[PDB]
Amino acid sequence: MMYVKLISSDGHEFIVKREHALTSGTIKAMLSGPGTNEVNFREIPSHVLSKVCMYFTYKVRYTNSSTEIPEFPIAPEIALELLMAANFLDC
Amino acid sequence: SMNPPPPETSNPNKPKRQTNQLQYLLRVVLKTLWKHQFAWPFQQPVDAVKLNLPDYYKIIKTPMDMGTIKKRLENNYYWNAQECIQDFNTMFTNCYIYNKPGDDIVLMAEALEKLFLQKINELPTEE
Amino acid sequence: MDVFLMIRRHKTTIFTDAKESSTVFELKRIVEGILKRPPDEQRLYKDDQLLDDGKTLGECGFTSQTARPQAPATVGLAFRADDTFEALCIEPFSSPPELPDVMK
Amino acid sequence: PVLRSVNSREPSQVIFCNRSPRVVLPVWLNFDGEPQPYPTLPPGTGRRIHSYRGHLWLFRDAGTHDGLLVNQTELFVPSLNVDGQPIFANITLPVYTLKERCLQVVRSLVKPENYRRLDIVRSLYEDLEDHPNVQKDLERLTQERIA
Numbered sequence: 001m002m003y004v005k006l007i008s009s010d011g012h013e014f015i016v017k018r019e020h021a022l023t024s025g026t027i028k029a030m031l032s033g034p035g036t037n038e039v040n041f042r043e044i045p046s047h048v049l050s051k052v053c054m055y056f057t058y059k060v061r062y063t064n065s066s067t068e069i070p071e072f073p074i075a076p077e078i079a080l081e082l083l084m085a086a087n088f089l090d091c
Numbered sequence: 092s093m094n095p096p097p098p099e100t101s102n103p104n105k106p107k108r109q110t111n112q113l114q115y116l117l118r119v120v121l122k123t124l125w126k127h128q129f130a131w132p133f134q135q136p137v138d139a140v141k142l143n144l145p146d147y148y149k150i151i152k153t154p155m156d157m158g159t160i161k162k163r164l165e166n167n168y169y170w171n172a173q174e175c176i177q178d179f180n181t182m183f184t185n186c187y188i189y190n191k192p193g194d195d196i197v198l199m200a201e202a203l204e205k206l207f208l209q210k211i212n213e214l215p216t217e218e
Numbered sequence: 219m220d221v222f223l224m225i226r227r228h229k230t231t232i233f234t235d236a237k238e239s240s241t242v243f244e245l246k247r248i249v250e251g252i253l254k255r256p257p258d259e260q261r262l263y264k265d266d267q268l269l270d271d272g273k274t275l276g277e278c279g280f281t282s283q284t285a286r287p288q289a290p291a292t293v294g295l296a297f298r299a300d301d302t303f304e305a306l307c308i309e310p311f312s313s314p315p316e317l318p319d320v321m322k
Numbered sequence: 323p324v325l326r327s328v329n330s331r332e333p334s335q336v337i338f339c340n341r342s343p344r345v346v347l348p349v350w351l352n353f354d355g356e357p358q359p360y361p362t363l364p365p366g367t368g369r370r371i372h373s374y375r376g377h378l379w380l381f382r383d384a385g386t387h388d389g390l391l392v393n394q395t396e397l398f399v400p401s402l403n404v405d406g407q408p409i410f411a412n413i414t415l416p417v418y419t420l421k422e423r424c425l426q427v428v429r430s431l432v433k434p435e436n437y438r439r440l441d442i443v444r445s446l447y448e449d450l451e452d453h454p455n456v457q458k459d460l461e462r463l464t465q466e467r468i469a
Contacts, residue, residue, distance in 0.1 A: 011229055012230075012231065013231070047313060047314060050224075050311055055420045071415060080428065080440055080441075086424050091421070198361055320439050321431040
């Protein structure tokens with residue numbers, strides 16, 4: 001089970017399954033060319049990066065499900081920062 | 092055929108008129124209803140041949156649709172706003188006559204009518 | 219079923235899943251694989267409650283219904299510090315700004 | 323003409339089932355491939371409807387026009403019934419990209435005339451304004467079908 005460490009601008013570290021972090025085209029690019037298991041985000045704070053990690057978990061659990069799936073919830077207070085992060089991360 | 096000709100939209104023997112209320116009925120009321128998700132059944136006369144409704148034009152003596160109303164407004168057919176409003180009411184009433192009270196088409200008509208009543212509630216005074 | 223977890227210590231968060239039927243000790247093995255400290259150097263918590271190694275996650279009150287992929291349940295982690303264990307200490311995340319007026 | 327219903331005149335009973343948290347707008351693509359919306363389904367509801375062999379359906383959020391899935395796919399066409407068994411159409415959320423899901427929530431909170439008062443990179447203004455659009459999704463799907 002390969003894990004990767006995603007580090008927020010404010011120094012929180014998030015350890016997620018590599019396969020889950022590859023939901024992000026940006027992270028995929030950043031880890032491309034082994035021939036690296038740590039990624040620093042200078043402009044994504046911890047409250048946003050935490051929520052992004054929950055999206056990765058949600059995406060891998062429910063993509064290609066044959067049946068119903070729940071709504072990914074986003075509080076109004078985080079929506080703009082999460083939009084910026086999602087745009088940056090290509091996920 | 093099963094289908095009568097549609098109602099006339101232009102009649103040289105019928106006095107034509109335009110008022111600011113009839114303008115509002117075209118530019119605001121008809122436009123809003125025309126653009127509604129459920130307008131499509133009401134945008135043209137009921138095609139009783141295609142829909143296989145051999146009794147439609149036996150049950151409905153005064154057919155009316157928003158395509159006819161649109162053309163009547165654009166051709167200044169109506170004497171006043173009341174005449175135009177009567178045509179919208181006839182369109183709704185015909186739907187309610189021909190169809191069962193819980194039918195899909197009746198719910199679509201009721202949605203348009205609710206909106207219609209909200210918009211004519213803001214009809215400008217004649218000026 | 220599966221339970222979706224966030225295991226938190228200081229400014230470390232592990233996102234992982236496990237089964238209701240898997241044990242607290244088994245979860246410490248997952249932590250060991252990731253942070254390279256053995257189970258005997260770990261205390262796991264649900265809120266302020268120390269979890270027994272032998273209990274299943276279900277017996278600890280984790281459930282599939284309240285530990286969802288999009289809203290994982292938090293497990294507190296404290297590491298041994300020589301002759302003692304550190305106090306459980308989960309550093310808060312940053313805060314969003316005030317909601318903009320145009321968002322009501 | 324690519325995405326349109328065939329005029330089979332062969333009846334096919336279908337169950338529409340809304341297993342999304344959205345109000346669903348069923349949309350029939352008629353014989354000229356033009357969208358004809360039908361009565362909405364509240365979340366968790368379903369009903370049995372009369373359609374026809376080779377008729378083409380899609381499903382949207384009735385309030386926002388966000389795209390939905392039916393039996394895991396963007397488009398639904400029924401079969402003939404076997405021994406009069408109804409055909410089932412299970413309507414669900416897709417997994418939206420996080421960016422699209424964020425655009426949904428911001429659009430749900432902010433009037434379009436206020437989009438350009440949010441402090442976000444300018445490119446996100448155009449993204450917010452680019453509302454989900456059945457015509458544009460039909461052009462993209464018709465692209466996909468050519469390939």
